[PDB]
Each structure stands twice: as structure tokens, then as C-alpha cells.
């Protein structure tokens, strides 16, 4: 029907997400953030499930929950390999981020912090993940539509190209 999402696989991964994105968290709990990446790395459908789960948390109306979700999403990009990158590089996932920033969707009830972090991530990905064509398609369209006026500054280090 809905696959492993409805099964133990999904329930477990969402349980891990709750922990890593609990709005009660004093700050980012990396014990739970990284643990979520590990579960994804061992699960056959970890990436497919995870991105749908992350997309949902990111679209949360509660700020701290969405923000931590964006941090976990970042951790997964650096710890879950191409298999994870490949699922984020599909419109099936990207359209969910677009709803967060477009006023025609959730756009008006999402803090500016969330929307800018989302923009910064998408942009950061166009630089770091050139072989993920769909991500720039989604980014440039946000530009072509005035949602993103000028590319934002992003966290960078020597490992980034």
C-alpha cells in the first residue's frame, strides 16, 4: 500500500526524528541527530522514508521543530551518501521545500528564519551537488519568481566546491 513507511521501518525512523527534533530540546542533540543518519544508512528504504519524514517536520508550524529538522536534513546530506542525495534531488521532495517558502502555500505562516535556512540549503546544494540537476531547477525557478532575489551567503569550508 504505502510501503515500509506504514511499517516498523517508518515508525522507527519517525520515532528517531521526534527525538532529534523535539521542541523541548535545550539545543541540538547530536546523539539523536547522527543516530537518525545511522538508521538511514542501515535501512533499505531509509532515504525514501527519511526525506518524506524530514519534509513533513520542516513544514511544521512550530519554529524550533522545523529548524532542528533542517539541521537533521543537513546532517543527512553530509552523512548518508549519494543514496540520500539522490532522493533529495527529486521534485517529489523539493516541491515540499518550495511550499515552505512560497506564499501561495505555507509561505505566509513560516518564520523568516526557516525560509532563509531553506534557501541557504538549496543554494548550498547547487554549489556542492552539481550532479543533482533537479535541485538547481528548483532553485532557479525560485529566482525566476522573485522568492529568491539574490543568492545568499552560506557556510563554507575547504571541503566545499
Amino acid at each position: 500500500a504505502m510501503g515500509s513507511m506504514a511499517e516498523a521501518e517508518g515508525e522507527s525512523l519517525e520515532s528517531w526524528l521526534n527525538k532529534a527534533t523535539n521542541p523541548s530540546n535545550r539545543q541540538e542533540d547530536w546523539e539523536y541527530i547522527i543516530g537518525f543518519c545511522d538508521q538511514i544508512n542501515k535501512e533499505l528504504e531509509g532515504p525514501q522514508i527519511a526525506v518524506r519524514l524530514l519534509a513533513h517536520k520542516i513544514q511544521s508550524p512550530q519554529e524550533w521543530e522545523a529548524l532542528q529538522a533542517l539541521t537533521v536534513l543537513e546532517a543527512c546530506m553530509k552523512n548518508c551518501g549519494r543514496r540520500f542525495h539522490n532522493e533529495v534531488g527529486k521534485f517529489r521532495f523539493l516541491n515540499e521545500l518550495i511550499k515552505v517558502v512560497s506564499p501561495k502555500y505555507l509561505g505566509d505562516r513560516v518564520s523568516e528564519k526557516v525560509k532563509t535556512k531553506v534557501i541557504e540549503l538549496l543554494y548550498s546544494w547547487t554549489m556542492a551537488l552539481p550532479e543533482e540537476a533537479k535541485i538547481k531547477d528548483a532553485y532557479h525557478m525560485l529566482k525566476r519568481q522573485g522568492i529568491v532575489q539574490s543568492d545568499p551567503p552560506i557556510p563554507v569550508d575547504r571541503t566545499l566546491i
Partner: peptide, 8 residues
């Protein structure tokens, strides 16, 4: 297997 870009 993928949806079309969400044209806003």
C-alpha cells in the same frame, strides 16, 4: 517515478 516541479 517522480512528480513535476511545483510551479508556484
Amino acid at each position: 517515478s517522480d512528480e513535476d516541479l511545483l510551479h508556484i
